[PDB]
């Protein structure tokens, strides 16, 4: 019971009360002291937890650890003892993001008279000292500075009342360090390359610039709520403590540090003239506001309805354009490179839940942001655009596809390849897949019809062709007859024995015919593949066969991207074709004209994931089997791991070799015909290569020797190398 009640109450304070917060902190303060005799360990645990899991409540709980320290010095000393232990653990386990919340909780305690202001400074001095450390990854040297600077919004003001001498010498080594960092990763992490309207800044430079405006403002920010402010009477005479000498953990080969980031920015106060002035991009208020909002989503991501509510009720010290901050932060997460913190579809419905909660004001802002995103499309990164398309099209389908399409009339007279028209075409294509062809033709104006998606009709070769000069024609006609008759494999094989030339012609007449007679639904085509599965495994026993199947299937369904995708997927899972073949198919000349369409990549990544999932699965089995006949298996599971990983490496190897080949071909041709290198085709192609790295950087890391010395070498065009070097900078 009691155990239970404590955790309940510890949370109540953070939650929205119905009696001034200060009161609750007053009460809970004593209550907790009264229970210290019997429940010291639990309360000591509960607080260390809320400290690393409820950052958005940082100051409500620091206060609490204060009122307590103001009634039991020895207690505070124990809490501060745990915190350091808890912090040393998070660090050793590579859970750096959790550490920051700890390191930041300590910081604010100094404002609660619990930790010696001078004490904090000594630790930070050691954090920055990491910048000197020799032969360590920059992402490591980066995290300590970030942990330091991100704290100042809380500690800085009072941490400036003391040790300014060293608290100047630290900024000194920082400034020095900040100007010596390589920024190779920025181009690969920016959502937009355009400097206007808003520059997308490297996260440390942006924060550095933020501290400055604060420092030069005498460290007086006006957002961070401080309950420990209305308790100066008590906290005053409290006896602070001293954090033991903190020696940052030595960089090991098992260390993994957060990747660098780029600050997503799309709004400024002019985007909301008639609304409370929006904190500027270089104001710490902006940082803190987005930080808490990001943390709120991190705490409630699993429950969308609770999530919207915690966001909308966010407590701001001084009024701010909340709705705008909520939308900006959600897009900041959806469009985050390499990946969003949470599953993509979560942002879609989260936004819906926010529109249902603030019916009168959220929708307009969301509609304003959509407009702005569309207008800045010209320099948005391909990976984000895809995300934009899927979000917007899925969003539309929840609001009867109602949108003011004429607002985007400008796309109508642009090269079909330009980002705007292409974006519209893709969005519409996506809307069709969530409903049907005719429905979409009906939602857009007559002027847009040209951008609507083609009717997804099957294309039989030997069909009502009547153009019979084609090879295997009659053979196909027998097949059609057999299939409609519940033919068997051997029978079909027989029909196929009468085919003149790995036999390309046999494949084509089989596929063209089998697919045509199952073109009514996905479920038909599937069973079709399952029934005559044996035939497939025969005709396509070779890679040429595998490749030819994909080629004929594409010939048949080129007007129905969703069909093509589900078929390839089904084919891979039933081993009618393998990923290598799918990869070669993607870069094949037969797809050259559709190379920049979304479905092509949606398929390639879905193939890569199946490969990855597969590898992971077998590895685990070995893992479990190794944790125990039982041997003959581990002998076998080992072999399977080998093959799986080998085929995985080969998939990345081929994909990269193909990218290098087509990009060089373009670069050379251009550098010969004195033509522009920056074509729409180039943009998609170079950014698609970048995406391979972004989506699977973890797996790719295992190939550094091969990648660094065998593929992406110096004889390669710098435009291609650039992509590789950007990737290496992610964990450099």
């Amino acid at each position: 019971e009691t155990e239970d009640h404590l955790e309940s109450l510890i949370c109540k304070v953070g939650e929205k009360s119905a009696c001034s917060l200060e009161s609750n902190l007053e009460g809970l303060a004593g209550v907790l002291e009264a229970d210290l005799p019997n429940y010291k360990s639990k309360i000591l645990r509960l607080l260390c937890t809320v400290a690393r899991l409820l950052p958005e409540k940082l100051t409500i709980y620091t206060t609490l650890v204060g009122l307590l320290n103001a009634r039991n010095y020895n207690f505070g000393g124990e809490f501060v003892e745990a915190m350091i232990r808890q912090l040393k653990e998070s660090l050793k386990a590579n859970n750096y993001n959790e550490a920051v919340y700890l390191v930041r909780f300590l910081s604010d305690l100094v404002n609660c008279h619990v930790i010696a202001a001078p004490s904090m400074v000594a630790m930070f001095e050691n954090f920055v000292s990491v910048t000197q450390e020799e032969d360590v990854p920059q992402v490591r040297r980066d995290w300590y500075v970030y942990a330091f600077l991100s704290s100042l919004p809380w500690v800085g003001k009072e941490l400036y009342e003391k040790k300014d001498a060293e608290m100047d010498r630290i900024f000194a080594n920082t400034e020095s360090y900040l100007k010596r960092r390589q920024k190779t990763h920025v181009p690969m992490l920016q959502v937009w390359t355009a400097d206007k309207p808003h520059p997308q800044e490297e996260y440390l430079d942006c924060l550095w610039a933020q501290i400055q405006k604060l420092k030069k403002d005498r460290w007086q920010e006006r957002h961070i709520l401080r309950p420990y402010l209305a308790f100066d009477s008590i906290l005053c005479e409290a006896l602070q403590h001293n954090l033991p000498p903190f020696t940052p953990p030595p960089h090991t080969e098992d260390s993994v540090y957060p990747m660098p980031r780029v600050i997503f920015r799309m709004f400024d106060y002019t985007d909301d003239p008639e609304g409370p002035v929006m904190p500027g991009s270089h104001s710490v208020e902006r940082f803190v506001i987005e930080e808490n909002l990001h943390c709120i989503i991190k705490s409630h991501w699993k429950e969308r309805k609770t999530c919207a509510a915690q966001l909308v009720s966010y407590p701001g010290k001084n009024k701010i354009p909340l709705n705008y901050h909520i939308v900006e932060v959600i897009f900041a997460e959806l469009f985050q490179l390499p990946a969003p913190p949470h599953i993509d579809v979560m942002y879609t419905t989260l936004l819906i839940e926010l529109c249902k909660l603030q019916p009168g004001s959220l929708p307009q802002v969301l509609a304003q942001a959509t407009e702005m995103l569309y207008m800045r499309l010209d320099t948005m990164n391909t990976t984000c655009v895809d995300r934009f398309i899927n979000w917007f099209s899925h969003h539309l389908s929840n609001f009867q596809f109602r949108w003011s399409w004429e607002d985007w009339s400008d796309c109508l007279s642009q090269d079909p390849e330009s980002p705007k028209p292409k974006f519209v075409r893709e969005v519409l294509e996506k809307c069709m897949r969530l409903s049907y062809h005719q429905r979409i033709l009906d939602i857009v104006p007559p002027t847009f019809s040209a951008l609507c998606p083609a009717n997804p009709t099957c294309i039989y070769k030997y069909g009502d062709e009547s153009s019979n000069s084609l090879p295997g024609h009659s053979v196909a006609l027998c097949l059609a007859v057999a299939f409609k008759s519940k033919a068997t494999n051997d029978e079909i094989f027989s029909i196929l024995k009468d085919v003149p030339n790995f036999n390309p012609l046999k494949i084509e007449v089989f596929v063209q015919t089998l697919l045509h007679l199952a073109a009514k639904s996905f479920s038909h085509s599937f069973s079709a593949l399952a029934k005559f599965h044996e035939v497939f495994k025969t005709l396509a026993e070779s890679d040429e066969g595998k490749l030819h199947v994909l080629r004929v299937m594409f010939e048949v369904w080129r007007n129905h991207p969703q069909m093509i995708a589900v078929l390839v997927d089904k084919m891979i899972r039933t081993q009618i074709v393998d990923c290598a073949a799918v990869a070669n198919w993607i870069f094949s000349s037969e797809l050259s004209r559709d190379f920049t369409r979304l479905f092509v990549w949606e398929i390639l990544h879905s193939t890569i994931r199946k490969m990855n999932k597969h590898v992971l699965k077998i590895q685990k089995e070995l893992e479990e089997a190794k944790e125990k006949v039982l041997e003959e298996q581990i002998e076998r599971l080992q072999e399977k791991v080998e093959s799986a990983q080998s085929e995985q490496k080969n998939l990345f190897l081929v994909i990269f070799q193909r990218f290098i080949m087509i990009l060089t071909e373009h670069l050379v041709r251009c550098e010969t015909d004195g033509t522009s290198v920056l074509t729409p085709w180039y943009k998609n192609c170079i950014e698609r290569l970048q995406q391979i790295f972004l989506q699977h950087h973890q797996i790719i890391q295992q190939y550094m020797v091969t990648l660094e010395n065998l593929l992406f070498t110096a004889e390669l065009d710098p435009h291609i190398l650039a992509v590789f070097q950007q990737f290496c900078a992610l964990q450099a």
Binding site: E7, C11, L46, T49, V50, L53, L54, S299, H300, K302, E303, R304, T306, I343, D344, V345, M346, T348, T349, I352, N390, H394, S397, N398, Q400, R433, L434, S435, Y436, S521, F522, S523, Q562, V566, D569, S606, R609, K610
Partner: protein
């Protein structure tokens, strides 16, 4: 660690298949380990293609089984979606449940598992039982309830 673990969208519903064999205990053990979902309120004309496109947003789908009129053998207004992993089914439960599929608000529920015969409406008239007593008009489910 603490109550942040809250996952109300993934919790078991009140529904229980009355034709299932085992205890309520055996049905519940299957439900908490399932990868297959029950999808309700579709229109009679909602296709497998649409279902695939929306439900794939939460992970890869293994199979989709359309609910049918036991006697007419036509789309009934419900279906079963089966994922390869429960994590993906949970996300559908979390972010797809309660949203629009083919212009109508759908509801997902954990399902013990598909078995031959689960695809047919148990509705007295062939369709879903739900439609026998519906007193509302629904042009996606054939107008008024069967008792009308």
């Amino acid at each position: 660690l603490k109550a942040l673990r809250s996952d109300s969208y993934v919790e078991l519903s009140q529904y229980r298949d009355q034709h299932f064999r085992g205890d309520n205990e055996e049905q519940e053990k299957l439900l908490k380990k399932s990868c297959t979902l029950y999808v309700g309120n579709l229109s009679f004309y909602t296709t497998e293609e649409q279902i695939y496109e929306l439900f794939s947003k939460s992970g890869d789908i293994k199979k989709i089984i359309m609910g049918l009129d036991k006697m007419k053998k036509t789309a009934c207004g419900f279906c079963f979606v089966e994922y390869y992993s429960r994590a993906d089914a949970e996300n559908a439960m979390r972010y797809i449940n309660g949203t629009r599929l083919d212009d109508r608000i759908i509801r997902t529920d954990w399902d013990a598992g598909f078995k031959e015969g689960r695809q047919y409406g148990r509705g007295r008239s062939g369709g879903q039982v739900r439609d026998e007593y519906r007193q509302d008009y629904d042009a996606g489910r054939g107008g008024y309830g069967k008792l009308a």
